[PDB]
Amino acid sequence: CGSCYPCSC
Ligand SMILES: [Cu+2]
């Protein structure tokens, strides 16, 4: 990241 921080989405 984003919305799923930390990722992979
Ligand atoms: Cu992320």
UniProtKB/Swiss-Prot annotation:
Residue location of crosslink Proline 5-hydroxy-oxazole-4-carbothionic acid (Pro-Cys): 6-7
Disulfide bonds listed in the record: 4-9
Source organism, top-level taxon: Bacteria
Membrane-spanning residues: none
Induction summary: By low copper concentrations.
Coiled-coil features, chain-numbered ranges: none
Localization annotation: Secreted; Cytoplasm
Amino-acid positions noted as binding Cu(2+) in the UniProt annotation, renumbered to this chain: 1, 7
Known partners and oligomeric status: Monomer. In the absence of copper, may exist as a dimer or an oligomer.
Function in brief: Chalkophore involved in scavenging, uptake and suppression of toxicity of copper. Each apo-methanobactin (apo-mb) complexes 1 Cu(2+) or Cu(1+) ion to form Cu(1+)-mb (Cu-mb) which is then taken up by the cell. Enhances growth rate in the presence of copper and reduces growth lag upon exposition to elevated levels of copper. Cu-mb contributes to the switchover from soluble methane monooxygenase (sMMO) to the membrane-bound particulate MMO (pMMO) by inducing transcription of pMMO subunit A. It also stimulates the enzymatic activity of pMMO.
Name of this protein: Methanobactin mb-OB3b
Record lineage: Bacteria, Pseudomonadati, Pseudomonadota, Alphaproteobacteria, Hyphomicrobiales
